[PDB]
Design a protein around this ligand. Structure first.
Ligand SMILES: *OP(=O)(O)OCC(C)(C)[C@@H](O)C(=O)NCCC(=O)NCCSC(=O)CCCCCCCCC
Length: 82
């Protein structure tokens, strides 16, 4: 995934887990480290699915460990369609 796609996901996540002002997010930052809980984590994918207009199961998003990890998977879905 490019730096642009990462910024979009990071922007939404940091905002979802906090204000994003007092929180630092990186492509190497793990979702668990950010504090993303079960109630939050589900919200992260929910917003991304709506923002990116895609659909992904939580089971598949298991290989996700960092922000970019999800970014790469999402980019793949976009390429699949159209
Ligand atoms: O929701 P919470 O109160 O945290 O409940 C936790 C729970 C008690 C259910 C615990 O037993 C639990 O987590 N069970 C499920 C197994 C588990 O530990 N899952 C961890 C989820 S973390 C995860 O998936 C990290 C990546 C998240 C990616 C989200 C964005 C993906 C976009 C494609």
């Amino acid at each position: 995934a490019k730096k642009e796609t990462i910024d979009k996901v990071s922007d939404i996540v940091k905002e979802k887990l906090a204000l994003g002002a007092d929180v630092v997010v990186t492509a190497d930052s793990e979702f668990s480290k950010l504090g993303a809980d079960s109630l939050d984590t589900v919200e992260i994918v929910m917003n991304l699915e709506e923002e990116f207009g895609i659909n992904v199961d939580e089971d598949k998003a298991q290989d996700i460990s960092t922000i970019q990890q999800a970014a790469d998977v999402i980019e793949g879905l976009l390429e699949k369609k159209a």
